[PDB]
Structure formats: structure tokens, C-alpha cells
Amino acid sequence: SKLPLLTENGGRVNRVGFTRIAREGSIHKFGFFYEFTQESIDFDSDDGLMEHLSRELMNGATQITEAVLQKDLLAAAGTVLYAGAATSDATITGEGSTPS
Amino acid sequence: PVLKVMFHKDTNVATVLDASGSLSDGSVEVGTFHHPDETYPDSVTIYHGVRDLLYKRSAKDPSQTASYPNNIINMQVISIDMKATPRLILGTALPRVISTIEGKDVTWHVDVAGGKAPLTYKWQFKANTVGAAFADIDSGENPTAKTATLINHAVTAESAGTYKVIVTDANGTTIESSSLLVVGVQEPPEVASIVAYPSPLALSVADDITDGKTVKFSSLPAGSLIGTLSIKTQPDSGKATAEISGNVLTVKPVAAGDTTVVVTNGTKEVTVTVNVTE
Amino acid sequence: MLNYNAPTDGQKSSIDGANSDQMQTFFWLKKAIITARKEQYFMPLASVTNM
Amino acid sequence: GAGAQATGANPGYRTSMVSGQEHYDVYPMLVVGDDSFTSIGFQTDGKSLK
After folding, report:
1. What function does this protein fulfil (chain A)?
2. Cα separation of B256 and C34, whole Å?
3. What DSSP state is assigned to residue A11?
4. B13 three-class SS
5. Which chain C residues have a beta carbon less than 8 Å from that of A15?
6. How far is D18 from chain B (nearest CA, A)?
7. CA–CA min distance A57, chain D (Å)
8. Separation CA D39–CA B251 (nearest Å)
9. Buried b (16+ CB within 10 A) or exposed e, D4-35
10. How far apart are CA B235 and CA B273, in angstroms?
């Protein structure tokens, strides 16, 4: 019933429009640090201690970013489905005749 | 809230307590600061407030005030011991605007931690009608309005308006996030009435003669096209003057006494009562 | 007819939906207006003795 | 601890304490559709965060 059929005379028929949506997001600031004395580096057994600590710092930063991304994705889910008979977070239960 | 600070010189420990809090271990009061920060709220933290007070005190006697270089200024040796009511932390704030079309299920999701458990949730909704207020969403009808995740099944043009989660801690501390729901109405309902806010409009000849005061108009139901507004009946020119631009009426007092302005969109009318005082 | 309308006056463009608006509603002229330094009349009058 | 309160009838599902009260934990099952999101960094090379 709504197909844009056209006759051989043309005319002002089958006019259409378009829409547009806008989406936004914001950034946040993160960081951590550690301190050390010169003796804890020079006299320490491992001449590569600083490399170890820097690698661990980088690994922690990357893991924190991954966790934050996962949390944001969970928070932004468009649809949420509750298992069992649950209707909300407070009702999600593992006991009774209909556990979630 | 204002947070007091106290400083032990021998242990170099700076304790942050509540404004009413107290410590009896040798710690001396070094001043107080507002922790959620009145201007620049997300720009600074307890460390910055503890560092700005200790800068005003003597290193040799922290009860006395000193100037550089005889003040407390190495924070690497100072350790802040927080013993004030803990603040709630929004881990995931609400989207600033969610958008949908009539008939779809909307879902808000706030993450909140910190404070003292248990944490309670109370969703509220303000209509888009001009002059409306927030109001608790019934958590008996909607079990999700008492949890961190709200769900609004089958939205309507009346679902449109601001939503807001208010989280409270066991100490009574609170945090809130808000989100405007925009609903796309395919066939907008035709106007039934125009609402004016504020109505009545209170004016003072002494205070409002230059700039006047404004009345905003909205349509009912919400999402109806209000159309072009015009003044159908001017106020008494001996009491007030009125001009309309878009959906805003500006009214200026002339002399004390009551008058009315009638505004129309050509099909509906609304009377604004105007009360002018000296 | 798709119109630009007046986004800054509350009338969105036809292309913009209920949850959209113009990204750029004005052009920013990056050359700023600045005031010149005040004139000095007594500093020039001062002769200098080296300390 | 975001789930309902848990009692001695727990058949063996995970729980955690919330201020001295036991509540069931809630676990997700997430589906991430194609091109549904992107991450934002400040002065990045387009491949990873700076």
C-alpha cells in the first residue's frame, strides 16, 4: 500500500525525508606512581629492578583500562534480561522453586 | 561538608576528621576546608586541602602560623589519616540523554560505590511540562525503581522527561545522576491546553521595572506542538506591559495592582494572573 | 522541504531529530581583541643612578 | 552481593556479605554487537591508548 509507484506523468509524488542522531562520550583521567631511594636501586641484587617495576606498572595500567572498558560496556547495555523469574537486581536469587 | 584537619608533629601524621570530630593524641588543629569543593569540585581532593593548611603553619610549632621557608612544605614525609565520613563515588554515571521511539523498553544503569553499606536506590521522574518537579517512581509497580538498574517497558510520549537515581549510604551520605529520555512520537497528539509557569506572576515595581519577569509556556499533553504564541489580551497598561517571543512572555510592572495577560496559539488560551506590588 | 530553520532560536533543522542538533552553530574568529599597554609618562622622566 | 538476600536454603550458589548480610552475587553474560562502540584516548595514534 505504500510502494512509491510512479506514473508516466511524474508529478510531486513520493516525497521523503531523513533524520539524524547525535551521540556523545567523555574522557576521564587516571594514574598511579611509586617511589624509591637510590640505595634501593644501586645496592639491590637485581640490576634490572627498574625494568621489572616499569613493566609491571604498564601491565597494571593496561589491565585497569580493560576493566574500565568492560564496566562501561556492561553499564551501557541497551537491553537487560533477567534469568529465571527475577524482575530486578534485588530479586535475583539462587534459592526457591524458580532460581535465577 | 567542611572537614577539619589536625597535625601531630612527632609522627608527622595529618588526620582529616569531620567538622564536629575530635582527636586527643597530641594532634593540633591546623584549619578546615570544604571537601566536595564549592568552586572546582572535581579539580582538587583532600591532599590539596591538607597541603594548603599545613603551608600556613610553623614546622617547629604547628599551632603557630609561619611563612616560607619556616612552614610545613614536604608532603612526602607527611601521611594523611582519613577518619571523616566517606564520600559516595559514581563509578558509572547515567547517559546524559537516552533516545528511543514509542513502544521500546528503555534501561538506565548507574554504578555507585564508596560510603558505608548498605547502599539504597530511589529513582525519580520530572515531566517535560514547564514548572514540574521530580517525583518517586513507584517501586511496588516497578520493582527496578529500588535498584541500580531502572527499566521502563513500552515507553510512551508521557515517559519523556528527566529521570534521576538518588543513592544513599548507611551514614546518610548521598550521590545523584540524571538522564533526559527523548521519545520519538510518529504522530504528535494535538494540543488540549497551554500551561503557564509561573502563574500567578508576582512583580515588584521597585525590583522588576527594568528587566521584568518571564513566564514560560508548555503544551499538554507533553510532546504536543504548542504552535505560535501571541498575546490575545494585553495587561492593563496602567499596571503592567507584556511582550511575547517564542514560548516566553516578558511582563514589566508600571504600578501596583492586579492585572491579567491572555496568551493564545490561535486554538487554545491561557490566562496569566499578574500581581504587582510597590 | 528540508530547511535550516534557526537552531540557535529553538527551531531545529529538518535533518535533526528529537535527539540531534547542529554541531557548529557559529564560526570562531581566532584573532582576539586585546588592549594595548598603558602609556608611561613619569618613567621616561627618571634618570638612573647605578646601584 | 547485588542479588536477593541468601539464607540457609542456598543450594550452592555464590554469595557475598553486605554489611553483615549475605546476598547472592549477580554475574553477566554480555553480547557486544559489531561497531557498537569505540574507545576515546587523548593524543593517541589510533591503535591504542596513550
Report:
1. Assembles, to form an icosahedral capsid with a T=9 symmetry, about 60 nm in diameter, and consisting of 535 capsid proteins.
2. 47
3. -
4. strand
5. none
6. 6
7. 14
8. 49
9. bebeeeeeebebeeeeeeebbebeeeeeeeee
10. 9
* β-pair partners for B161: B127, B181
d(CA C47, CA A96): 98
Could you give phi then psi for residue A68, rounded to 5 degrees? -65, -40
Distance of CA C16 to the CA centre of its chain: 26
- Residue B60 at interface with chain D, using a CB cutoff of 8 Å: no
Grid cell of B239 as nine digits: 499596571
Please, do chains A and D touch (3+ CB pairs < 8 Å)? Answer: yes
CB burial of B77-92 (b: ≥16 within 10 Å; e: otherwise) equals ebebeeebbeebebeb
Question: What are B100's three cell numbers?
Answer: 528511543
The grid coordinates listed for D47 are 591503535
Measured CA to CA, the distance from residue C15 to residue B154 in angstroms comes to 26
Cell numbers for A10, please give them: 511524474
Distance (Å) of CA A64 to CA A58, A69, A70: 10, 9, 10
Cell numbers 561538608 correspond to: B1
Distance CA B160, CA B102 (A): 10
Q: B213: closest CA among B263, B264, B248, B182?
A: B248
Q: How many CB atoms lie within 10 A of CB A39?
A: 8
Residue D12 CA: distances (Å) to CA of B64, D5, D15, D25:
62, 14, 9, 12
∠ Cα B218 B224 B228 (to 5°) = 65
User: Of B186, B184, B179, which Cα lies nearest the Cα of B98?
Assistant: B179
Q: How many CB atoms lie within 10 A of CB D43?
A: 5
Residue of C nearest to B227 (CA): C11
- Nearest residue on chain D to A95, judged by CA atoms? D10
For this PDB entry, the determination method is: cryo-EM
- Give the three cell numbers for residue B137: 517512581
Q: Looking at chain B, how many residues does it have?
A: 278
Q: Determine phi and psi for B53, rounding to 5 degrees.
A: -70, -50
3-state secondary structure of A16: coil
Mutate to test the interface with A, among D14, D38, D49, D50 (most CBs of A within 10 A): D49
**Virtual CA dihedral for B261, B266, B270, B273, nearest 10 degrees?**
0
